[PDB]
Amino acid sequence: PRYLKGWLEDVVQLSLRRPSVHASRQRPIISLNERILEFNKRNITAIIAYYLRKERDPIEYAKYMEPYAVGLSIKTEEKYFDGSYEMLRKIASSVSIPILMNDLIVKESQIDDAYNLGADTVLLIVEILTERELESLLEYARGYGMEPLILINDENDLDIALRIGARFITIYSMNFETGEINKENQRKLISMIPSNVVKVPLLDFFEPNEIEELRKLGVNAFMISSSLMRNPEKIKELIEGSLE
């Protein structure tokens, strides 16, 4: 990885030391980005349900979101989010929709864990990896049949991601030291992405109007965290018309 400081470097060193799992995956890969493509052709609003334990139960949240979300994001970082590989494994073997393993992935054995635990794709972060490392892990994920979700926070991230051939990009526009999502630069970054790349902004809190606005910006799917954890029912109004 790159040399970083503070809590990022703490997590990165923990991820480097993360022991591999010895599970064997018990179902095929349900590709997240292809399912977003299918949702797009059918004009179905594609919502990725962003789950992090630290507060609802992981299985309950996953079963609830299964009929409505285009896929789940499961944070498996253990220290600052209290995720776990076993939690992801229980989730993947009980829901039928794609599972994104959300973690700080810095080594190939983490992608091996993801594949072996039932996850369908992985998150790769331009800011923590060298450009060649990111290219290597992107190609490595593809060899498993996983098109990974490439996280960009700024313009330089995006140009690295486009240069190395990312086709699945999530726009956080987030400062990891604070956790604040700058929605304006997020909108600008979304505009800078070619149309042929599946682009997915992260929205912690949202109002129903800004989803239609981002939809006008050409967004393929929405990863929503905090709002859907506080009110899971909010996803229904996003993906279907009301009968009442």
Side-chain angles (χ1 to χ4, degrees), residues 1-4 6-9 11-25 27-33 35-53 57-59 61-85 87-89 91-176 178-183 185-186 189-203 205-206 208 210-214 217-229 231-236 238-244:
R2 289 167 182 266
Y3 178 92
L4 321 159
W7 92 275
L8 269 194
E9 194 67 13
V11 156
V12 162
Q13 292 301 308
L14 213 55
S15 314
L16 282 170
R17 272 136 55 194
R18 185 125 199 206
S20 314
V21 302
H22 304 270
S24 307
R25 98 175 274 129
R27 79 153 162 80
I29 279 188
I30 315 157
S31 149
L32 174 53
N33 76 301
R35 208 199 177 208
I36 287 160
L37 290 182
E38 290 281 33
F39 271 48
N40 288 167
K41 283 194 252 192
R42 318 222 203 290
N43 265 267
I44 309 179
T45 299
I47 303 302
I48 303 169
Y50 191 103
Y51 177 80
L52 56 153
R53 226 210 293 257
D57 183 79
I59 290 172
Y61 186 90
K63 294 304 294 184
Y64 185 88
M65 286 303 184
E66 191 184 20
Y68 312 115
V70 83
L72 304 195
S73 176
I74 306 304
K75 202 84 173 169
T76 54
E77 201 281 319
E78 307 182 297
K79 185 170 239 242
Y80 299 80
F81 304 91
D82 205 27
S84 85
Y85 278 155
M87 179 189 63
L88 160 71
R89 188 193 195 179
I91 284 187
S93 84
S94 37
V95 309
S96 51
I97 61 180
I99 310 292
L100 160 80
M101 192 181 86
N102 200 314
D103 208 327
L104 274 89
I105 288 152
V106 295
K107 56 175 182 164
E108 292 181 337
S109 99
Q110 283 172 287
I111 300 180
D112 293 316
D113 306 332
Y115 178 86
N116 291 322
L117 293 151
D120 298 282
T121 196
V122 290
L123 186 77
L124 299 175
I125 304 175
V126 183
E127 275 192 358
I128 67 183
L129 309 165
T130 71
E131 171 186 64
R132 160 195 156 89
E133 273 181 316
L134 172 72
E135 182 157 12
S136 157
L137 290 172
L138 160 63
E139 285 172 0
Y140 190 68
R142 282 173 179 162
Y144 268 123
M146 306 177 153
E147 181 63 18
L149 191 47
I150 309 299
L151 190 159
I152 69 180
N153 284 311
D154 50 39
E155 303 210 352
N156 191 234
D157 287 1
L158 176 58
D159 224 20
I160 292 177
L162 295 171
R163 168 160 60 258
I164 62 136
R167 277 120 57 170
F168 196 21
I169 294 189
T170 183
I171 303 96
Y172 274 41
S173 265
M174 166 189 295
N175 185 277
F176 282 133
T178 65
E180 276 324 289
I181 298 122
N182 179 22
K183 308 232 176 180
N185 183 37
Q186 172 177 77
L189 283 173
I190 289 162
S191 299
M192 295 182 254
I193 305 176
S195 93
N196 69 325
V197 165
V198 178
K199 54 206 89 45
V200 181
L202 175 72
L203 300 322
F205 291 96
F206 78 100
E210 72 158 323
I211 291 317
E212 255 277 27
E213 304 289 291
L214 295 174
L217 253 53
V219 152
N220 303 75
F222 307 83
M223 200 143 66
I224 293 166
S225 28
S226 303
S227 298
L228 294 198
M229 212 150 319
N231 303 267
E233 68 274 10
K234 279 176 160 50
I235 193 176
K236 283 162 89 69
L238 278 166
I239 59 103
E240 63 173 12
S242 195
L243 280 166
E244 265 305 341

Coordinates of all heavy atoms in Angstrom, one line a residue, residues 109-153:
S109 N -4.9 -12.1 -0.7 CA -5.5 -13.1 0.2 C -6.9 -12.5 0.7 O -7.7 -13.3 1.1 CB -4.6 -13.5 1.4 OG -5.0 -12.8 2.5
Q110 N -7.0 -11.2 0.8 CA -8.3 -10.6 1.1 C -9.4 -10.9 0.1 O -10.6 -11.2 0.4 CB -8.2 -9.1 1.4 CG -7.6 -8.8 2.8 CD -7.3 -7.3 2.9 OE1 -6.4 -6.8 2.3 NE2 -8.1 -6.6 3.7
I111 N -9.0 -10.8 -1.2 CA -9.9 -11.1 -2.3 C -10.2 -12.6 -2.3 O -11.3 -13.1 -2.6 CB -9.3 -10.7 -3.6 CG1 -9.1 -9.2 -3.7 CG2 -10.2 -11.2 -4.8 CD1 -8.5 -8.7 -5.0
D112 N -9.2 -13.4 -1.8 CA -9.5 -14.9 -1.7 C -10.5 -15.1 -0.6 O -11.4 -15.9 -0.7 CB -8.2 -15.6 -1.3 CG -7.2 -15.6 -2.5 OD1 -7.6 -15.8 -3.6 OD2 -6.0 -15.3 -2.2
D113 N -10.4 -14.4 0.6 CA -11.4 -14.5 1.6 C -12.7 -14.1 1.1 O -13.7 -14.9 1.3 CB -11.0 -13.6 2.8 CG -9.6 -13.9 3.3 OD1 -9.1 -15.0 3.1 OD2 -9.0 -12.9 3.8
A114 N -12.8 -13.0 0.4 CA -14.1 -12.6 -0.2 C -14.7 -13.7 -1.1 O -15.9 -14.0 -0.9 CB -13.9 -11.3 -1.0
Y115 N -13.9 -14.2 -2.0 CA -14.5 -15.2 -2.9 C -14.9 -16.5 -2.1 O -15.9 -17.1 -2.4 CB -13.4 -15.6 -3.9 CG -13.9 -16.8 -4.8 CD1 -14.6 -16.5 -6.0 CD2 -13.6 -18.1 -4.6 CE1 -15.1 -17.5 -6.8 CE2 -14.0 -19.1 -5.4 CZ -14.7 -18.8 -6.5 OH -15.2 -19.8 -7.3
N116 N -14.1 -16.9 -1.1 CA -14.3 -18.1 -0.3 C -15.5 -17.9 0.6 O -16.1 -19.0 1.0 CB -13.1 -18.5 0.4 CG -12.0 -19.0 -0.5 OD1 -12.3 -19.7 -1.5 ND2 -10.8 -18.7 -0.2
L117 N -15.8 -16.7 1.1 CA -16.9 -16.5 2.0 C -18.2 -16.3 1.3 O -19.3 -16.1 2.0 CB -16.6 -15.3 2.9 CG -15.4 -15.5 3.9 CD1 -14.7 -14.2 4.2 CD2 -15.8 -16.2 5.2
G118 N -18.3 -16.2 0.0 CA -19.5 -16.1 -0.7 C -19.8 -14.7 -1.3 O -20.8 -14.5 -2.0
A119 N -18.9 -13.7 -1.0 CA -19.1 -12.4 -1.6 C -19.0 -12.5 -3.1 O -18.3 -13.3 -3.6 CB -18.0 -11.4 -1.0
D120 N -19.6 -11.5 -3.7 CA -19.6 -11.5 -5.2 C -18.7 -10.4 -5.8 O -18.4 -10.5 -7.0 CB -21.1 -11.2 -5.6 CG -22.0 -12.3 -5.2 OD1 -22.0 -13.4 -5.8 OD2 -22.8 -12.1 -4.2
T121 N -18.2 -9.5 -5.0 CA -17.2 -8.5 -5.5 C -16.6 -7.8 -4.3 O -17.0 -8.0 -3.2 CB -17.8 -7.5 -6.5 OG1 -16.8 -6.9 -7.2 CG2 -18.7 -6.5 -5.8
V122 N -15.6 -7.0 -4.6 CA -14.8 -6.4 -3.5 C -14.7 -4.9 -3.8 O -14.8 -4.4 -4.9 CB -13.4 -7.0 -3.4 CG1 -13.4 -8.4 -2.9 CG2 -12.7 -7.0 -4.8
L123 N -14.4 -4.2 -2.7 CA -14.1 -2.8 -2.8 C -12.5 -2.6 -2.9 O -11.8 -3.1 -2.1 CB -14.6 -2.0 -1.6 CG -14.5 -0.5 -1.6 CD1 -15.6 0.1 -2.5 CD2 -14.7 0.0 -0.2
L124 N -12.1 -1.8 -3.9 CA -10.7 -1.4 -4.0 C -10.6 0.1 -3.9 O -11.4 0.8 -4.6 CB -10.1 -1.9 -5.3 CG -10.0 -3.5 -5.4 CD1 -9.5 -3.8 -6.8 CD2 -9.2 -4.1 -4.4
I125 N -9.6 0.6 -3.2 CA -9.6 2.1 -2.8 C -8.3 2.6 -3.4 O -7.2 2.3 -3.0 CB -9.6 2.3 -1.3 CG1 -10.9 1.6 -0.8 CG2 -9.6 3.8 -1.0 CD1 -11.0 1.7 0.8
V126 N -8.4 3.6 -4.4 CA -7.3 4.2 -5.0 C -6.4 4.9 -4.1 O -5.1 4.9 -4.2 CB -7.8 5.2 -6.1 CG1 -6.6 5.7 -6.9 CG2 -8.8 4.5 -7.1
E127 N -6.9 5.4 -3.0 CA -6.1 6.3 -2.1 C -5.1 5.5 -1.2 O -4.1 6.1 -0.8 CB -7.0 7.1 -1.2 CG -7.5 8.4 -1.9 CD -8.2 9.4 -0.9 OE1 -8.3 9.0 0.3 OE2 -8.5 10.5 -1.3
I128 N -5.4 4.2 -1.0 CA -4.5 3.4 -0.1 C -3.6 2.5 -0.9 O -2.7 2.0 -0.3 CB -5.4 2.6 0.9 CG1 -6.2 1.5 0.2 CG2 -6.3 3.5 1.7 CD1 -7.0 0.7 1.1
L129 N -3.8 2.4 -2.2 CA -2.9 1.5 -3.0 C -2.1 2.4 -4.0 O -2.6 3.4 -4.5 CB -3.8 0.5 -3.8 CG -4.8 -0.3 -2.9 CD1 -5.8 -1.0 -3.8 CD2 -4.1 -1.3 -2.0
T130 N -0.9 1.9 -4.3 CA -0.2 2.4 -5.5 C -1.0 2.0 -6.7 O -1.8 1.1 -6.7 CB 1.2 1.8 -5.5 OG1 1.2 0.4 -5.9 CG2 1.9 2.0 -4.2
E131 N -0.7 2.8 -7.8 CA -1.5 2.6 -9.0 C -1.2 1.2 -9.6 O -2.2 0.6 -10.1 CB -1.0 3.6 -10.1 CG -1.5 3.4 -11.5 CD -1.0 4.4 -12.4 OE1 0.3 4.4 -12.7 OE2 -1.7 5.2 -13.0
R132 N 0.0 0.7 -9.4 CA 0.3 -0.7 -9.9 C -0.4 -1.8 -9.0 O -0.9 -2.8 -9.5 CB 1.8 -0.9 -10.0 CG 2.3 -2.3 -10.1 CD 3.8 -2.3 -9.8 NE 4.2 -3.7 -9.3 CZ 4.5 -4.7 -10.1 NH1 4.6 -4.5 -11.4 NH2 4.9 -5.8 -9.5
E133 N -0.3 -1.6 -7.7 CA -1.0 -2.4 -6.8 C -2.5 -2.5 -7.1 O -3.1 -3.6 -7.1 CB -0.8 -2.0 -5.4 CG 0.4 -2.5 -4.7 CD 0.4 -2.0 -3.2 OE1 0.2 -0.8 -3.0 OE2 0.7 -2.8 -2.3
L134 N -3.1 -1.3 -7.3 CA -4.6 -1.3 -7.6 C -4.9 -2.0 -9.0 O -5.9 -2.7 -9.1 CB -5.0 0.2 -7.7 CG -6.4 0.4 -8.2 CD1 -7.4 0.0 -7.1 CD2 -6.6 1.9 -8.5
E135 N -4.0 -1.8 -10.0 CA -4.2 -2.5 -11.2 C -4.1 -4.0 -11.0 O -4.8 -4.8 -11.6 CB -3.2 -2.0 -12.3 CG -3.3 -2.7 -13.6 CD -2.7 -1.8 -14.7 OE1 -2.0 -0.8 -14.4 OE2 -2.9 -2.1 -15.9
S136 N -3.1 -4.4 -10.2 CA -2.9 -5.9 -10.0 C -4.1 -6.5 -9.2 O -4.5 -7.6 -9.6 CB -1.6 -6.1 -9.2 OG -1.6 -7.3 -8.5
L137 N -4.6 -5.8 -8.2 CA -5.7 -6.3 -7.5 C -7.0 -6.3 -8.3 O -7.9 -7.1 -8.2 CB -5.9 -5.6 -6.2 CG -4.8 -5.8 -5.1 CD1 -5.0 -4.9 -3.9 CD2 -4.8 -7.3 -4.7
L138 N -7.1 -5.3 -9.2 CA -8.3 -5.2 -10.1 C -8.3 -6.4 -11.0 O -9.3 -7.1 -11.2 CB -8.3 -3.9 -10.8 CG -9.1 -3.8 -12.1 CD1 -10.6 -4.0 -11.9 CD2 -8.9 -2.5 -12.8
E139 N -7.1 -6.7 -11.7 CA -7.0 -7.8 -12.6 C -7.2 -9.1 -11.8 O -7.8 -10.1 -12.3 CB -5.7 -7.8 -13.3 CG -5.6 -6.8 -14.4 CD -4.2 -6.7 -15.0 OE1 -3.3 -7.4 -14.5 OE2 -4.0 -5.9 -15.9
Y140 N -6.7 -9.2 -10.6 CA -6.8 -10.4 -9.7 C -8.3 -10.6 -9.4 O -8.7 -11.8 -9.5 CB -6.0 -10.2 -8.5 CG -5.9 -11.5 -7.7 CD1 -5.2 -12.6 -8.2 CD2 -6.5 -11.6 -6.4 CE1 -5.1 -13.8 -7.4 CE2 -6.4 -12.8 -5.7 CZ -5.7 -13.9 -6.2 OH -5.6 -15.0 -5.5
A141 N -9.0 -9.6 -9.0 CA -10.4 -9.8 -8.8 C -11.2 -10.3 -10.0 O -12.0 -11.1 -9.9 CB -11.0 -8.4 -8.3
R142 N -10.8 -9.7 -11.2 CA -11.5 -10.1 -12.4 C -11.2 -11.6 -12.7 O -12.1 -12.3 -13.2 CB -11.0 -9.2 -13.6 CG -11.7 -7.9 -13.6 CD -11.0 -7.0 -14.7 NE -11.7 -5.7 -14.8 CZ -11.2 -4.6 -15.3 NH1 -10.0 -4.7 -15.9 NH2 -11.8 -3.5 -15.3
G143 N -10.0 -12.1 -12.4 CA -9.7 -13.5 -12.6 C -10.6 -14.4 -11.8 O -10.9 -15.5 -12.3
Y144 N -11.2 -14.0 -10.7 CA -12.2 -14.7 -10.0 C -13.6 -14.5 -10.6 O -14.5 -15.1 -10.1 CB -12.2 -14.3 -8.5 CG -11.3 -15.1 -7.5 CD1 -10.4 -14.4 -6.8 CD2 -11.5 -16.4 -7.4 CE1 -9.6 -15.1 -5.9 CE2 -10.8 -17.1 -6.5 CZ -9.8 -16.5 -5.8 OH -9.0 -17.2 -4.9
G145 N -13.7 -13.6 -11.5 CA -15.0 -13.2 -12.0 C -15.7 -12.1 -11.3 O -16.9 -11.9 -11.4
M146 N -14.9 -11.3 -10.6 CA -15.4 -10.2 -9.8 C -15.0 -8.9 -10.4 O -13.8 -8.6 -10.5 CB -14.9 -10.2 -8.3 CG -15.2 -11.5 -7.6 SD -14.4 -11.4 -5.9 CE -15.4 -12.6 -5.1
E147 N -16.0 -8.1 -10.9 CA -15.6 -6.7 -11.2 C -15.7 -5.9 -10.0 O -16.8 -5.6 -9.4 CB -16.6 -6.2 -12.3 CG -16.3 -4.8 -12.7 CD -14.9 -4.6 -13.4 OE1 -14.3 -5.6 -13.8 OE2 -14.4 -3.5 -13.5
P148 N -14.6 -5.4 -9.4 CA -14.6 -4.7 -8.2 C -15.0 -3.3 -8.3 O -15.0 -2.7 -9.3 CB -13.1 -4.8 -7.7 CG -12.3 -4.8 -9.0 CD -13.2 -5.6 -10.0
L149 N -15.5 -2.8 -7.2 CA -16.0 -1.4 -7.1 C -14.8 -0.5 -6.6 O -14.3 -0.7 -5.5 CB -17.1 -1.3 -6.1 CG -17.9 0.0 -6.0 CD1 -18.3 0.5 -7.4 CD2 -19.2 -0.2 -5.1
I150 N -14.4 0.4 -7.5 CA -13.2 1.2 -7.3 C -13.7 2.5 -6.7 O -14.4 3.3 -7.2 CB -12.5 1.4 -8.6 CG1 -12.2 0.1 -9.3 CG2 -11.2 2.2 -8.4 CD1 -11.4 -0.8 -8.5
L151 N -13.2 2.8 -5.5 CA -13.5 4.0 -4.7 C -12.6 5.1 -5.1 O -11.4 5.0 -5.0 CB -13.4 3.7 -3.2 CG -14.0 4.7 -2.2 CD1 -14.2 4.0 -0.9 CD2 -13.1 5.9 -1.9
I152 N -13.2 6.2 -5.5 CA -12.5 7.5 -5.8 C -13.0 8.5 -4.8 O -14.2 8.6 -4.4 CB -12.7 7.9 -7.2 CG1 -14.1 8.4 -7.5 CG2 -12.3 6.8 -8.2 CD1 -14.3 8.9 -8.9
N153 N -12.1 9.4 -4.3 CA -12.5 10.5 -3.5 C -12.2 11.9 -4.1 O -12.7 12.9 -3.6 CB -11.7 10.5 -2.2 CG -12.3 9.5 -1.2 OD1 -13.5 9.4 -1.0 ND2 -11.4 8.6 -0.6

